[PDB]
Structures are given as C-alpha cells and as structure tokens.
C-alpha cells in the first residue's frame, strides 16, 4: 500500500541521529516531556473553549492517559488536547522548532545535558531515547485524523486514518527498545509520574488494570 514518506529537515535529521543508540543516565525524562506536551495541548483547547465552546465538540473532557501494552511491548501517551493537522505533522512544527533544534544541537556538541531538551522546545524527540519506532495518531478540529511514524533513519511517514477512535487529540505510541522494557511496569510508571510529573494540572491517568 502506498505510504507518503518525507525526509526530515536538516537540523531535525541531525538531532534524531544524535539521540538514537546513545548511552544516557536519565532516559526516564522522556515521560515528563510527553506529559508536558499533552498538558500544553489540553491548555490550548481549554483556552480556545473560553471564547468558542463549540471547539470542544463531542469531546468536552481534557485528559492525559498513560497506557503500557505488556503484549505489544509499547507505551502509549494519549491526550484529548488540541491535536495536530497534516500540515503540522509534515512542516509547521519543524518550522517553529527549527531555531531551537539547531541551538540544542550546538549545546549537545558542547557537552550539554540531554535533560534540558524541553527548554529548547523539542522534548518530543526524547521518546527516541527509549523507543526504536514512534507512531503518532492525531486529530485536530481543522483536519482529518492522520498517522505520523518514524524509526529515526532520516524519514517519516504520514497516512490518513479515517477510522481511528480519537474525536480530538494525540496518541503517541512508543515501541520500546529491547533494554527499555522497564517503562511497561506499573511501579516504575507510578514512581516516574510521581517523580517528575506530580503537579501537572490534569490527572495523569495510568491504566493499571
Ligand atoms: C507528530 O509528532 C510530533 C512532532 C513531529 C513534533 N512535535 C510533537 C509534539 N507536539 C506538537 N504538538 C502537539 C500536540 Cl497538539 N499534542 C501533543 N501531545 N504533542 C504535540 C509531535 C507529537
């Protein structure tokens, strides 16, 4: 089946090349980065709803949910936030992140700590510290539902998903690397949500059973 595939922009391509298959002592920070993004997406739609309540549509509840899949060996971070359009997935996010991507790359070449990735506005990419593939399913009010996917080899796919569960928001599926399986464990995820994301202004829903 024909899948639309794109080459990442120079700076992102170089940043992902840096992140993958590298030792780091605090790879657990990926969770804080994805939850903060989800909190921000929820805040954007909450803000839009203050002027136009119709923006909430059939999904009036704002949540952040963490789903470990012990059979598929995946960790999912899903929210009912603003979501992303096709143009966001393909170009717009990379355009706004460009300067910060180049600046973080420069900090990393200088011995910079990977934990400050979020201050550079490219925190999503920390998912590649623990995953070898990331699938991103997103539905924004202004577009159809789309699936973005990448194994950080320089390319990414973008496919329309006109049959996904999502009324609005983003679902990030982390296909965990063989040695990063600890992020599927209930205690680890509880301790991790508590350690770095305790006072997030939305419940961090952890699928326990
Ligand atoms: C598609 O994959 C992404 C890319 C290539 C860059 N940044 C983000 C972070 N990000 C940007 N907007 C986002 C929204 Cl609306 N929501 C969430 N959860 N993450 C977001 C994502 C998920």
Numbering used by the authors: 0 to 208
Wording from the paper:
Among the chaperones, heat shock protein 90 (Hsp90) – alternately referred to as Hsp83 or Hsp86 because of the variable molecular weight amongst different orthologues – is a hallmark of the stress response at the cellular level, and a major component of the eukaryotic proteome. Its main function is to serve as a molecular chaperone helping nascent polypeptides avoid mis-folding and limiting protein aggregation during thermal stress. T. brucei Hsp83 (TbHsp83), the subject of interest herein, is 59% identical in sequence to human Hsp90α.
The compound was slightly bent by T. brucei Hsp83 NTD to adopt an angle of ∼100° between the planes of the purine ring and pyrimidyl rings. The purine moiety showed a hydrogen-bonding pattern already seen in the adenosine-binding pocket in other Hsp90 structures in complex with ADP or ATP mimetics. The N6 (adenosine numbering scheme) was hydrogen-bonded to the δO1 of Asp78 and N1 to the γO of Thr169. The elongation of helix-3 at its C-terminus joining with helix-4 into a single helix, created this modified pocket. Two residues, Asn90 and Asn91, shifted significantly their position by over 3 Å in their Cα atoms, when compared to the other TbHsp83 NTD complexes with inhibitors.
